[PDB]
């Protein structure tokens, strides 16, 4: 049993004004809520219990528009992240919601795409030791944890947000740990940039030989959405997709309906309040089609 | 001397479930929020003082926002609208706040841009008698109210929503009136469709010769920011623009420094807080340099 | 060994006028022709000999942009296709190019990206009988050749553009033959619509046991780009994509490059040519990079 | 009288390799081919004579395109520019064309979009003496003719892309000049960047107090489609426009119909061949619907 969370915090100043009415995680990507992105991929690694780590004035929101995630099959959870000081404190301030579990955590405005998807989580997910991590090609690597391969593709390093990037690999924000994180993550020193982070926790289970890093091949898509641009970005991204397909991309309802975690009934309670739109009427027609 | 109101309630149904998150007037179009947008066109047009009625759950954060509008030499104070029930209601719930005044109505999600815009808006705003409204061709009439003209120019009839429109030029979310406003408004019956509609009330005034009708030309860019799809193609657009330019589209701060509302120091004590972004760093730039 | 068949021609109407310049399958898809994709799909599929169709105002056009293939290890041919009386002239046309062997068709408006398509891609080329295409779910089947399954996932029936669709799953234009097609092929009757149409071929594998359908993931994108509109939304598509990575879709002196049709020289001499801009700077850079 | 001068010459390798299959202004901008643009622009500033400059290469086919313009009521001529040696060679290669007449030059990848845009061009194309400009406030005047003013709204500088730009106003791609140019041209010398160029004829008139730069405000649209991005931009600017207008920008029938220079029946005959998509179909709902 993995245990997922969500770190959506985070500094406003970059959005203002945009986000001087909302958390970053609650604007829309085209036509659903940022953060419905990365809760539906924790999903997709078969993971229901979920903690939700924001800021003090957002998660009374998260908390409006998720509940507890019984309607959905998951069991939500949300917790407080006073001040920014690294996504490596999501380790501390979950301690106990993680106990003595595997773990995983994603960024909350980190959105993927792509075919297999949930084979490539899966393999991750079922690995009950060690930590997994991800990395994509970029062209701006300098902005992101960058990882280092040898001829033999072997990983050799990480170095965050680095002057001069070894590669062009970027490990992404999805991570999967083992029971050692935690206590890893207890013994780290904020950064000179003064923040712990991710990248000190990753690295120490490099130095371990335990550091899983798998590649996503240039054929997903690995989005973030932490500027105005990316954000409309990834809302043309989304809806060619959809309005190509007639399917959506990161729908939570189905997915809990095609993992059987809710049942054809569950579903179209859940589509009633919304029958008057689109997104209703989509919950709808999923009754009724088969969708392989 | 004329206010404004600008109408920002909203059953959010449609953009569900992203408004699930917070309602549409705070979304963002691109860069900043979308009720920006309209309340720059209401102060282009000469008004400082303008009540914002919006939904009882909305109007608190409306109020977070903007505050009482004296940061931007505005006078800004807020109503509620407890339930859709037509435009026209506005000028109900606003009946103490306009007086024996002239008035100006604009909506919450249409959007303005174009060369001399604030002439145009000026040619109406300084009429003291009869009502004004803008038409702007279209290709889906059906979706607005629409008003015919004869052969001659002149405005002949208006049909809200038609199955069968007699012309394709739709009568935008802008609307100026005179002091008879709130009376026929106090008469009016709610439509089938059971509302107040503003179309009743400029029909009132066409029926008694009083509405004046200016075409708003092919070169100006009316947008409704209604839907998921036109939400996206409007952030599109005022990217395109903004990033052409080197300059903001509906910002607020900037209209009212060139009008003169607020000075230089007020408008250095308004970017000091934004400094760490490029809103605030817009806002310093334009303390030096000339922008004709 | 399979040989390839692009579909080039029609007229292409939809597209007037811009296409009063071009055919539509020189126009470009952000940074390259159209008809760069579907190339470099077969390419992907192993594919390396190759005959192009197009109308005859457009051939010489073609073949003043590809040259015989050789600069890019492949070996290309052209042929013309007098009227647009439907794909499956294809065969005819292409019949002695084909000779006795296995062959494939690519329709050139069809844009498909996504992980391991190249796997996917290889099923269906190494298969050696029968014939194999693929099904993909879309939001308007009416517009394709639609395929039916049974609960079973089997293939049970074929229509081209039918008013009431039996399912969502569109055929895609890809499309793998054994070496019954030409003579398949040659005994079809135009259909109403007046041409010969490539679901009667399908029709003709499926009545005989011998139709192989396999889906293709709501993970993999698959665009038409013959309208205006479909044109621009690709257009964004590879551009966000592109830009993220630093790494292009369907660029055919990489895919050789990798597959090792040409070698460290030929690619330095082909970017050459080009090195006054990015396409010859990304050649360059591949020389030097390894990318998993 | 003035005549007109279309310079649409060059390589574009920046649009290399798209640009291979066809010169950069055959591209379509979204719906029409992109000389369209410039063409028009000429057309609204009453310009019936227009001589279209461009490689040797390309005039064939812009003269399969365009004709003669008889159709729309111009007198298209051609002439060819063999080597890309600066815009100034325009009035060299055109001495002749503009014999003793006022003239008027436009860049062929410079797209201008409204309101009253045909009163700010007859401004200009009225005035019988000097040059005029216009200046356009923009992100990145490093790229162009960049112009400074004094405190009084008077020009007093050109600099042709300087590393240090004096202000943020661009020259835009069109020109109009009195008969001292051709002269003014014959006395240039290359610049060190080895052109003849347009900044440089109007930093002559500058120096004789006779060159008038107008300011294009912010409410106009000038875009220019030099690059992959730039021409995806542009595609989707105009495609906004036009879905949500029911009309195009551009159509050079229209305006031809428009000014009377042709009629309704020559009109018909133009739509005719078009009928069976939207462009013809436009064309001939333009006979039925008045248009303000
Ligand atoms: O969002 P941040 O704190 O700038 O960066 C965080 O996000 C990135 C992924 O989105 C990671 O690659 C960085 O290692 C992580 O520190
Ligand atoms: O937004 P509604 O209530 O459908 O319609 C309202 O908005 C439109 C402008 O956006 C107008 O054309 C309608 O006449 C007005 O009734
Ligand atoms: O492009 P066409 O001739 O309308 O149709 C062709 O295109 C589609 C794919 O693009 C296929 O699904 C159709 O079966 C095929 O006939
Ligand atoms: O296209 P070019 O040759 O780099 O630049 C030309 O175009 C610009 C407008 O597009 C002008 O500002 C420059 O003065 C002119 O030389």
Not at 113 to 127: K, M, N, P, T, V
Not at 141 to 149: A, M
Not at 243 to 256: D, H, S, T, W
């Amino acid at each position: 049993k993995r245990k997922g969370i969500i770190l959506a915090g985070g500094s406003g100043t970059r959005l203002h004004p945009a986000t001087l009415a909302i958390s970053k995680q609650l604007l829309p990507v085209y036509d659903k809520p940022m953060i419905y992105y990365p809760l539906s991929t924790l999903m997709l690694a078969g993971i229901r219990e979920i903690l939700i780590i924001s800021t003090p004035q957002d998660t009374p929101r998260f908390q409006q528009l998720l509940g507890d995630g019984s309607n959905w099959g998951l069991d939500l959870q949300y917790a407080v992240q006073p001040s920014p000081d690294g996504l490596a404190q999501a380790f501390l301030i979950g301690e106990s919601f993680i106990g003595n579990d595997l773990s995983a955590l994603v960024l909350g405005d980190n959105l993927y795409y792509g075919h297999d998807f949930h084979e490539l989580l899966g393999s991750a997910s079922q690995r009950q030791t060690g930590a997994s991590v991800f990395a994509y090609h970029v062209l701006d690597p300098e902005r992101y944890g960058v990882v280092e391969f040898d001829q033999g593709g072997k990983a050799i390093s990480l170095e965050e947000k680095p002057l001069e990037p070894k590669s062009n690999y970027a490990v992404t924000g999805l991570y999967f740990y083992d029971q050692q994180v935690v206590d890893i993550a207890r013994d780290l020193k904020p950064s000179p940039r003064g923040e712990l982070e991710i990248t000190d926790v990753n690295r120490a289970y490099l130095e371990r030989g335990q550091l899983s890093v798998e590649i996503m091949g240039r054929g997903y898509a690995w989005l973030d959405t932490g500027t105005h641009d990316s954000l409309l970005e990834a809302g043309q991204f989304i809806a060619t997709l959809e309005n190509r397909q007639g399917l959506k991309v990161a729908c939570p309802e189905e997915i809990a309906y095609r993992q059987k975690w809710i049942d054809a009934a569950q579903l179209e309670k859940l589509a009633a309040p919304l029958a008057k739109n689109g997104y209703g009427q989509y919950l709808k027609r999923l009754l009724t089609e088969t969708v392989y």
